[PDB]
Amino acid sequence: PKLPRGLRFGADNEILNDFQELWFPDLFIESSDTHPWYTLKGRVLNAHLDDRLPNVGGRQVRRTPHRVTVPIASSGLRPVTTVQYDPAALSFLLNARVDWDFGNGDSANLVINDFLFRTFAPKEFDFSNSLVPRYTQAFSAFNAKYGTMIGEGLETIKYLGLLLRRLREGYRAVKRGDLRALRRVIQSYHNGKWKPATAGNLWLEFRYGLMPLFYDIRDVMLDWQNRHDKIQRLLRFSVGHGEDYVVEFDNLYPAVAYFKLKGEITLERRHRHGISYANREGYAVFDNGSLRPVSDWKELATAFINPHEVAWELTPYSFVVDWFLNVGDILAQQGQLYHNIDIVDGFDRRDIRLKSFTIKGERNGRPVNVSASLSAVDLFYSRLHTSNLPFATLDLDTTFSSFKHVLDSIFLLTQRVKR
Amino acid sequence: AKLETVTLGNIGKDGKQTLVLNPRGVNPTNGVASLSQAGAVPALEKRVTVSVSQPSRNRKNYKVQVKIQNPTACTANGSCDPSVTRQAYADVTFSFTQYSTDEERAFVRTELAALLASPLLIDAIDQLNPAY
Amino acid sequence: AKLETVTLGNIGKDGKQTLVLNPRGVNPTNGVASLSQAGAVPALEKRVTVSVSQPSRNRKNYKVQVKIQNPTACTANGSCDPSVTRQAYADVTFSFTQYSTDEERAFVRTELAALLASPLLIDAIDQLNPAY
Amino acid sequence: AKLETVTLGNIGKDGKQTLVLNPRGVNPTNGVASLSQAGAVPALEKRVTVSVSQPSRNRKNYKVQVKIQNPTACTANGSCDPSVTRQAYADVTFSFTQYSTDEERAFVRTELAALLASPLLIDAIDQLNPAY
DSSP B50-70: EE-----SS-SEEEEEEEEEE
The backbone region for A186, taken as left when phi is positive above 0, alpha when psi lies in -120 to 50, beta otherwise, is alpha
Enumerate long-range contacts of A177-184, CB under 8 Å, 24 or more apart: A179/A205, A182/A206, A182/A209
- Residues in A closer than 8 angstroms to C120, CB to CB, are none
Q: What is the C-alpha to C-alpha distance for residues C42 and C22, in angstroms, rounded to an integer?
A: 12
Range of the domain at D108: 1-131
Contact status, residue A17 vs residue A6, Cβ threshold 8 Å = yes
Give the three-class secondary structure for B109: helix
Contact status, residue C88 vs residue B108, Cβ threshold 8 Å = yes
- Residues in B closer than 8 angstroms to C132, CB to CB, are 1-3, 26
- Residues in B closer than 8 angstroms to C18, CB to CB, are none
Give the max Cα distance, chain C: 57
Sign of CA dihedral C52, C55, C58, C61: positive
For A223, A226, A321, the CA distances from A232, given in Å and listed in that order, are: 15, 11, 32
Q: What are chain B's partners, defined as 3 or more CB pairs within 8 angstroms? A: A, C, D
The total of other beta-carbon atoms located within 10 Å of residue A329's CB is 13
B108 secondary structure, DSSP code: H
Contact status, residue D130 vs residue D124, Cβ threshold 8 Å = yes
Mutate to test the interface with A, among C126, C127, C129, C132 (most CBs of A within 10 A): C132
Question: Do chains C and D touch, with touching meaning 3 or more CB–CB pairs less than 8 Å apart?
Answer: no
Q: What is the C-alpha to C-alpha distance for residues C29 and C26, in angstroms, rounded to an integer?
A: 9
Residue B105 is inside which H or E element, if any? helix B102-117
Residue B115 is inside which H or E element, if any? helix B102-117
Q: What is the C-alpha to C-alpha distance for residues B98 and B106, in angstroms, rounded to an integer?
A: 15
Contact status, residue C45 vs residue C34, Cβ threshold 8 Å = no
> By C-alpha distance, which of B130, B117, B112 is closest to C52?
B130
Cβ-in-10-Å burial (0-12, 13-18, 19+) of B35 comes to: buried
Which residues fall within 8 angstroms of residue A412, CB to CB, at 6 or more apart?
none
Report how many helices (DSSP H) and strands (DSSP E) chain B contains, helices first. Answer: 2, 6
Return the C-alpha torsion angle B112, B115, B116, B117, nearest 10: 130
Contact status, residue B105 vs residue B96, Cβ threshold 8 Å = yes
The CA radius of gyration of chain D, in Å to the nearest whole number, is 18
Q: What is the C-alpha to C-alpha distance for residues A121 and A249, in angstroms, rounded to an integer?
A: 9
Residue B33 is inside which H or E element, if any? strand B32-36
> By C-alpha distance, which of A171, A194, A218 is closest to A414?
A171
Total structural domains in chain C? 1
Q: At what angle do helices A397-414 and A316-335 cross, to 10 degrees?
A: 160
Contact status, residue B26 vs residue B33, Cβ threshold 8 Å = yes
Which residues fall within 8 angstroms of residue A60, CB to CB, at 6 or more apart?
A29, A30, A88
Sign of CA dihedral C99, C101, C105, C107: negative
CA angle D43, D46, D49 (to 5 degrees): 105
Contact status, residue D42 vs residue A404, Cβ threshold 8 Å = no
C109 secondary structure, DSSP code: H
CA angle C107, C108, C110 (to 5 degrees): 70
Alpha helices in chain C (DSSP H): 102-117, 119-125
Which residues fall within 8 angstroms of residue A170, CB to CB, at 6 or more apart?
A182, A185, A206, A209, A210
* Documented resolution in Å: 4.4
End-to-end, the C-alpha distance of chain A in Å comes to 47
Q: What is the C-alpha to C-alpha distance for residues A59 and C4, in angstroms, rounded to an integer?
A: 69
CATH of the domain at C60: 3.30.380.10
Contact status, residue B107 vs residue B96, Cβ threshold 8 Å = no
Query: How many CB pairs (< 8 A) connect B and D?
Result: 21
Which amino acid would we find at residue C106? A
Alpha helices in C55-99 (DSSP H): none
Cβ-in-10-Å burial (0-12, 13-18, 19+) of B93 comes to: middle
Contact status, residue B83 vs residue B74, Cβ threshold 8 Å = yes
Q: How many angstroms away from the CA of A134 is the closest CA of chain C?
A: 7
What is the chain C residue with the closest CA to B98? C86
Query: How crowded is the C-beta side of B22, counted as CA atoms within 13 Å?
Result: 7
3-class DSSP string for chain A: CCCCCCEECCCCCCCEECHHHHHCCCCEECCCCCCCCCCEEECECCECCCCCCCCCCCCCCEECCCCCCCCCCCCCCCCCCCCCCCCCCCCCCEEEEECCCCCCCCCCCEEEEEECCCCCCCCCCCCHHHHHHHHHHHHHHHHHHCHHHHHHHHHHHHHHHHHHHHHHHHHHHHHHCCCHHHHHHHHCCCCCCCCCCCCCCCCHHHHHHCHHHHHHHHHHHHHHHHHHHHHHHHHCCEEEEEEEEEEECCCCCCECCCECCCCEEEEEEEEEEEEEEEECCHHHCCCCCCCCCCCCHHHHHHHHHCCCCCCCCCCHHHHHHHHHHHHHHHHHHHHCCCCCEEEEEEEEEEEEEECCCCCCCEECCEECCEEECCCCCCCCCEEEECCCCCCCCCCCHHHHHHHHHHHHHHHHHHHHHCC
Experimental technique = cryo-EM
CB-nearest to C88 from B91, B108, B129 is: B108
Question: Do chains B and D touch, with touching meaning 3 or more CB–CB pairs less than 8 Å apart?
Answer: yes
* Record: contact C105-B126, CB cut-off 8 A: yes
- Residues in D closer than 8 angstroms to A281, CB to CB, are 41
Sign of CA dihedral A195, A196, A199, A204: negative
Which residues fall within 8 angstroms of residue A219, CB to CB, at 6 or more apart?
none
Q: How many angstroms away from the CA of D98 is the closest CA of chain B?
A: 6
The total of other beta-carbon atoms located within 10 Å of residue A106's CB is 11
What does residue A198 show for φ and ψ, rounded to 5 degrees?
-75, 140
Residue B103 is inside which H or E element, if any? helix B102-117
The backbone region for D128, taken as left when phi is positive above 0, alpha when psi lies in -120 to 50, beta otherwise, is left
Contact status, residue C17 vs residue B108, Cβ threshold 8 Å = no
Report how many helices (DSSP H) and strands (DSSP E) chain D contains, helices first. Answer: 2, 6
Q: At what angle do helices A297-305 and A211-232 cross, to 10 degrees?
A: 170
Interface of D with B (CB under 8 A): 26, 28, 31, 54, 98-102
Contact status, residue A406 vs residue A349, Cβ threshold 8 Å = no
Sign of CA dihedral C109, C110, C113, C115: negative
